[PDB]
Symmetry: C6
Subunit: 66 residues, 6 copies
């Protein structure tokens, strides 16, 4: 299930800069390189691996249709 | 199960502004655009994807029947 | 399972004011309107939906038998 | 499984005052009245229901064998 | 699975003092008395029961082979 | 699943220094010695065992292909 995948794929495909806010309030920025049901790979200087269980919200930097 | 879906659907359908409070105390605001069992899409300038595991409470801005 | 349901039902039925403390230390107050295994609906001016995964403790404002 | 139950039962049966520390650092005190795999009922003036997912450590006020 | 058990058993058997850091940054110290897949029993003046879901990292006070 | 394993294996095999940020904002550093689906063993002076449920992001100190 089911909503996640089209939303994240749209961001990934359009290479939209996003802000990922973590469960501790820390903000990550970059482009979604790929994802599965457990992690998101977020690209800027290096690819970092973000655990979805530690994500609170994914905020596109501009409107993106899914 | 079972309580969530009528509650969130009522908010979504009536387009009631809500406050979503996260597990770190951060408050999000907007209208519920859609949801499944893992995320809520919360609309204002952009659609942001909120993970339910990081939500503590959903507070309608006015009384809504479910 | 098994302890939750009689405890929360007693509060709900007796309409006992409770304090719900969240995993971030934030205190909610109101009466338990209904619940399932994922959320509690907590009533005051509006019904708010509290996720049990974000609850640390439910504290009745007075002794209640279960 | 398997370690929890003898440990908590020993506390419950011996009516040992405990400190329950939550995942946010908040300390609860009282005696364990009962428990299942999801919650602990902690007694002082009222019985409060503590969610095990929000517990970090259970600390007996004195040595207890299990 | 699979890595945990040899690591924690090595600490337990060698009675190595460890620091257990919790998800809120609080540090516990003592020796691992026993464990299962849900909790660790950590010994100093009393045995305290630590929930693994609230543990971030287990740090031996000296190098231990597993 | 599926993304984690090639990413972490690449770090492990190349012995890339990483920063592991925990869900409370605390940063760990060292090299990934091994991992399974529940923990990562992170090496510096001692091997410490990090629970993946307490990890927010794994950040390689330099670009690594997976």
């Amino acid at each position: 299930q089911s909503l996640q995948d089209p939303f994240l794929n749209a961001l990934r495909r359009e290479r939209v800069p996003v802000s990922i806010y973590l469960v501790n309030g820390i903000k990550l920025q970059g482009q979604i390189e790929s994802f599965d049901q457990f992690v998101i790979l977020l690209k800027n200087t290096v690819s970092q691996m973000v655990y979805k269980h530690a994500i609170s919200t994914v905020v596109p930097s501009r409107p993106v249709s899914h």
